[PDB]
């Protein structure tokens, strides 16, 4: 006999009901509550907006961040090139470059990655080489000095 009829709302007995009150619960609601959107690098732009000073600053800051990330070991640039080629060829494709940037975990938009790939592709072969990669990501290359050179 249950003279106290009904399961009721709120917590009940230990081993009978969960800790959470039945008034507020019984559903996996807040397991992924973040309270804030992911914050980008302040210099980057989601859209392209080419031909502008803000785009020049975004490209310069992105290349400087990439250079500082890839020039930490003595041979981190070669190691990252090896980890990013993927298809065992010595060249790097668009999807492999995208996957490498995602592995480096910099929150960069797809169009901005494509723009960086286009500036890296000096010979316009549709495919980066080791020379193009290292020339863009030297430790104090001209694309890194473009961060200092804002007035152009």
């Amino acid at each position: 006999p249950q003279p106290l009829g009904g399961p009721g709302l709120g917590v009940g007995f230990p081993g009978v009901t969960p800790q959470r009150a039945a008034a507020a619960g019984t559903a996996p609601t807040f397991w992924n509550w973040q309270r804030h959107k992911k914050q980008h690098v302040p210099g980057l732009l989601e859209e392209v907006r080419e031909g502008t000073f803000e785009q020049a600053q975004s490209d310069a800051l992105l290349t400087s961040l990439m250079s500082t990330k890839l020039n930490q070991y003595r041979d981190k640039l070669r190691l990252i090139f090896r980890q990013m080629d993927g298809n065992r060829n010595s060249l790097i494709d668009r999807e492999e470059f995208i996957r490498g940037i995602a592995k480096l975990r910099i929150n960069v938009s797809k169009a901005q990655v494509e723009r960086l790939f286009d500036l890296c592709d000096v010979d316009k072969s549709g495919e980066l080489d080791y020379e193009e990669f290292v020339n863009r990501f030297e430790e104090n290359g001209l694309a890194s000095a473009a961060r200092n050179q804002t007035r152009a």
Partner: protein, 432 residues
């Protein structure tokens, strides 16, 4: 018709007492808004013991809510069943005790205990006849210990003929959550043996062993401990709120458990605690509730009941149940192992039957144990205090608020007198 006034104190007592108001409001049918929606007429039988009246059928608890930091009353009010408390009872400080007994008892407590007592005197004068004051707090804390025991001293002078239940948590011997816990524990007990009428000792690392091994909970969160505590504090009062065959009020459990005014420390237990997956595997019966009651791994105190003889004991059975089976089982547990019970008290164990079981189960029981084995918990706290006080460690944070070092001397002289008094009655024979 007789009412119990609940006081919760500090960060520890607020979250512990919040879960107590989680379970009683559901077990009496109060929804989070404050109205009534249960379909049982026994829920509305004795609501006055823990709920007041309001317009439109609203029932608000007799709770005075206390801490020196306003952070916890943001957390208490935000959850479910947090809107049922009156905001006038949300008396809060600004600075915070910060795990210092001196700040809670002397400086920041005396500036706040005047406004707190006005809330308590409001609730005492409102109801018909006080059964007693129930307090849930901490001993190693700063607000539940420093200013919690300040309220106990103040409210004992104003109401000296009333009961006093203290569900106070104690530091663990294995791992301590605060470095200055032995200072705050030893100062609290000296202020608590003279004032508090009876006391229930809780320990977190006894509850961790309960959660891991009885509830099969691999990663027990901080509030699952409170729900085990909340069921006992609801189970301590089952005879008051509901009819039964034998009724045991707070004073009835006082007279049957403390033989002497200074031996008022209990270790408390909780019987029908099986895992969720074992609800069909465990066959519930009166021998099964009795067997898990006296098991030493079931006790919510860190002290081992097999080390010291049980002075007295009490059982609060709930549910439609046979009075002969308990009465045969209580004789059986006393006569199977007589070495764990003191010889000069016949009938160590008191039994009370409430015929209305809790929600979801048809039989339940709550165990109160007045054992001399609780001196082992007091001796471990004593050993910590003597090791620290000899070299005056962490003492400038206590003498800064006016508590001289002479106050710490009698905090130990009544501490070691407890374990001396608990040792003698254990060693006491029927003759001498």
């Amino acid at each position: 018709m007789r009412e119990i006034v609940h006081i919760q104190g500090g960060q520890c007592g607020n979250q512990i007492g919040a879960k107590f108001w989680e379970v009683v409001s559901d077990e009496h049918g109060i929804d989070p808004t404050g109205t009534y929606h249960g379909d049982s007429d026994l829920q509305l039988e004795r609501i006055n013991v823990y709920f007041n009246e309001a317009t439109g059928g609203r029932y608000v608890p007799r709770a005075i809510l206390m801490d020196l930091e306003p952070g916890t009353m943001d957390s208490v009010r935000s959850g479910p069943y947090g809107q049922i408390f009156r905001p006038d009872n949300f008396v809060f400080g600004q600075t915070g005790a910060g795990n210092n007994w001196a700040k809670g008892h002397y400086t920041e407590g005396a500036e706040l205990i005047d406004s707190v007592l006005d809330v308590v005197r409001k609730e005492a004068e409102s109801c018909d006849c006080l059964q007693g004051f129930q307090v849930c707090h901490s001993l190693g804390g700063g607000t539940g210990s420093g200013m919690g025991t300040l309220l106990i001293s103040k409210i004992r002078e104003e109401y000296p003929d009333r009961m006093m239940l203290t569900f106070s948590v104690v530091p663990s011997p294995k791992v301590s959550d605060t470095v200055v816990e032995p200072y705050n524990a030893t100062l609290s007990v000296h202020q608590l043996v003279e004032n508090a009428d009876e006391c229930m000792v809780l320990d977190n690392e006894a509850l961790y062993d309960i959660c891991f091994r009885t509830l099969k909970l691999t990663t027990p969160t901080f509030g699952d401990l409170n729900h085990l505590i909340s069921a006992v504090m609801s189970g301590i009062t089952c005879c008051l709120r509901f009819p039964g065959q034998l009724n045991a009020d707070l004073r009835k459990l006082a007279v049957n458990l403390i033989p002497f005014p200074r031996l008022h420390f209990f270790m408390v237990g909780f019987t029908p605690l099986t895992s969720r997956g074992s609800q069909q595997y465990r066959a519930l019966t009166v021998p099964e509730l009795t067997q898990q009651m006296w098991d030493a791994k079931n006790m919510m105190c860190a002290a081992d009941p097999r080390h010291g003889r049980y002075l007295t004991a009490s059982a609060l059975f709930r549910g439609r149940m046979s009075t002969k089976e308990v009465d045969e089982q209580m004789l059986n547990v006393q006569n199977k192992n007589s070495s764990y019970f003191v010889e000069w008290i016949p009938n160590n164990v008191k039994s009370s039957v409430c015929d209305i079981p809790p929600k979801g189960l048809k039989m339940s029981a709550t165990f109160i144990g007045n054992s001399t084995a609780i001196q082992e918990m007091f001796k471990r706290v004593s050993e910590q205090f003597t090791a620290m006080f000899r070299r005056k460690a962490f003492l400038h944070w206590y003498t800064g608020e006016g508590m001289d070092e002479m106050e710490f001397t009698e905090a130990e002289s009544n501490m070691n007198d407890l374990v001396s008094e608990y040792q003698q009655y254990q060693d006491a024979s029927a003759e001498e």
